């Protein structure tokens with residue numbers, strides 16, 4: 001690409017950056033519990049869990 | 051004496067196996083399988099097995 005005639009047409013050469021994209025597919029596994037565990041609330045909770 | 055006798059036949063197998071691990075390198079050029087990769091110069095002459 002010629003920047004002199006591109007400056008004549010009205011374009012100015014900006015910054016130059018890289019394309020350091022994607023990578024190794026190393027994995028990991030987690031557990032998502034949904035029901036919260038109440039232990040102090042054994043006195044007054046009724047059956048609102050149901 | 052038993053230890054001195056077995057140390058002559060314990061060490062070079064260990065050296066050979068760590069050289070086998072040194073011939074391989076966990077690398078990945080571009081969209082590779084992210085593994086294998088051995089150097090052709092560091093292995094010399096070898097078969098498929």
Ligand SMILES: *[C@@H]1O[C@H](CO[C@@H]2O[C@@H](C)[C@@H](O)[C@@H](O)[C@@H]2O)[C@@H](O[C@@H]2O[C@H](CO)[C@@H](O[C@@H]3O[C@H](CO)[C@@H](O)[C@H](O)[C@@H]3O)[C@H](O)[C@H]2NC(C)=O)[C@H](O)[C@H]1NC(C)=O
Pocket residue numbers: 068069072
């Ligand atoms: C098996 O590989 C290990 C690890 O070295 C890595 O793999 C090699 C195949 C090369 O690609 C290395 O660039 C790469 O790091 C080798 O162990 C290394 O041995 C060298 C000597 O051969 C050690 O260097 C010494 O380190 C200290 C510096 O204070 C001084 O005693 C010496 O001046 C000398 O430089 C080096 O520390 C050591 N470890 C690492 C992590 O590089 C190993 O030699 C190689 N092959 C065999 C046959 O065992």
Ligand SMILES: *[C@@H]1O[C@H](CO)[C@@H](O)[C@H](O)[C@H]1NC(C)=O
Pocket residue numbers: 039040
């Ligand atoms: C509240 O729960 C915690 C954690 O299980 C326990 O240590 C504590 O004794 C409980 N307190 C009461 C008042 O039940």
